[PDB]
Amino acid sequence: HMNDIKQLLWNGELNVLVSIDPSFLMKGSPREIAVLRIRVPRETYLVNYMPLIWNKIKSFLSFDPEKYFWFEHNKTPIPWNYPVGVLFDCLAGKSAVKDVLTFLRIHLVMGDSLPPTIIPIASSKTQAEKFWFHQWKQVCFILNGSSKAIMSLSVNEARKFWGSVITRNFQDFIEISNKISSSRPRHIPLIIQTSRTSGTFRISQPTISMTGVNPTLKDIEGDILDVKEGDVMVICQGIEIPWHMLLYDLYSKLRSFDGFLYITLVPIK
Amino acid sequence: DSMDDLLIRRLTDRNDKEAHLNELFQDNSGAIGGNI
């Protein structure tokens, strides 16, 4: 059922190897300082781990805490403002005394010339919450036609909503997310992306009306395929999704923790 | 339900595979979700 499925997504979790570039550290500091081996939920943001990072390297920093900070994967800038699982799917591709280790390698970097479209890691401890709540405000509007449902939550209710993401309180998350919208969607909050690993990466947020209709993924093939296509596998929440899958079902069950349903397109052959 | 059964099956498998060798990533064992 739905909640069982949502519980599986909530329990989603990855092995993440974080490396701190020497640029942040004092020449000669212990190896263990620049490395963190952690478990990170698919439904969260990498930025929620800055406190953990800072607390470990504080005593060995190479500066007094005008450079910018951001994450990278194999020398390629990676946006912190997407759920970790979505970043993973984008990097994994078809991947959806010797063993296969499934993990995400992340490197904390600094610099003066902030990379294109990259939102730097802030010192403002409400950066993620502010961005995330703004995500849900858009979602409420997309789903209900208005943002009334979310604006009506008490201030503490909204804080409790974000709080559940940090504490992993499934009950609270389900409680508030459902309150924002539990009716049938007017439109679907859908984001479509390709790979950040292979080829020319692209992302789109097509407008998809749901009033009086019940489209399948195939039905919206016009938003998924490009002009050149007029050989694509759809990956959502790290798994393969059939073309006959109903969009309402997909959204209502597999949407991410920021309220948006994300699909990753990967070449089959 | 069979579609839901398909979802559960693939998501469970996903979690299992992604949980493999988690013993090597225990530096935040007491704070999975990070911190405020």
What are the domain boundaries of chain A?
A: 13-121, 122-181, 184-267
Residue with tokens 């004092």: A26
Q: What angle do CA A122, A128, A132 make, to 5 degrees?
A: 145
User: Rounded CA gap, A43 and A234, in Å?
Assistant: 19
User: Rounded CA gap, A47 and A43, in Å?
Assistant: 12
Phi, psi at A200, each rounded to 5°: -90, 105
**Are the Cβ atoms of A102 and B18 closer than 8 angstroms?**
yes
CA-to-CA separations, A137 to A64, A140, A148, A184, A189, in angstroms, rounded: 37, 5, 9, 17, 11
Two tokens at B19?
């949980």
Closest chain A C-alpha to B2 CA, distance in angstroms: 10
A residues 146-185 closer than 8 Å to B (CB): 165-168
- Domain A184-267, what fold? Ubiquitin-like (UB roll) (3.10.20)
On the 0-12 / 13-18 / 19+ scale of CB atoms within 10 A, A193 is buried
Instruction: Identify residues after which chain A is interrupted (C–N over 2.5 A).
Output: 65, 96, 230
Q: Does A220 touch chain B (CB under 8 A)?
A: no
For residue A115, give every residue at least 6 positions away whose Cβ sits within 8 Å of its Cβ, in sequence order, or none.
A70, A77
CA-to-CA separations, A129 to A4, A163, B6, in angstroms, rounded: 26, 9, 33
Could you tell me whether strands A203-204 and A190-193 are parallel, antiparallel, or unpaired per DSSP bridges? antiparallel
Give the nearest chain B residue to A89 (CA atoms): B14
B residues 1-36 closer than 8 Å to A (CB): 3-4, 6-8, 10-12, 14-15, 17-22, 24-29, 31-36
Closest chain B C-alpha to A227 CA, distance in angstroms: 30
**Are the Cβ atoms of B33 and A165 closer than 8 angstroms?**
yes
For residue A214, give every residue at least 6 positions away whose Cβ sits within 8 Å of its Cβ, in sequence order, or none.
A246, A247, A248
Residue range A122-181 forms a domain whose CATH class is mainly alpha
**Are the Cβ atoms of A37 and B29 closer than 8 angstroms?**
no
The experimental technique behind this entry is X-ray
Select the residue from B25, B26, B29, B35 to test the A interface by mutation, using most A Cβ atoms within 10 A.
B25
**Are the Cβ atoms of A38 and B27 closer than 8 angstroms?**
yes
Question: Do the domains A184-267 and A13-121 match in fold?
Answer: yes
Give the nearest chain B residue to A17 (CA atoms): B25
Question: CB neighbours (10 Å) of residue A32?
Answer: 9
Radius of gyration in angstroms for the set of CA atoms belonging to chain A, rounded to a whole number: 20
By three-state DSSP, how is residue A264 classified?
strand
HSE of A17, CA atoms in CB hemisphere, 13 A: 11
> What is the architecture of the domain spanning A13-121?
Roll (3.10)
CA-to-CA separations, A138 to A147, A177, A190, A216, in angstroms, rounded: 7, 13, 11, 23
> Residue A250 is which amino acid?
L
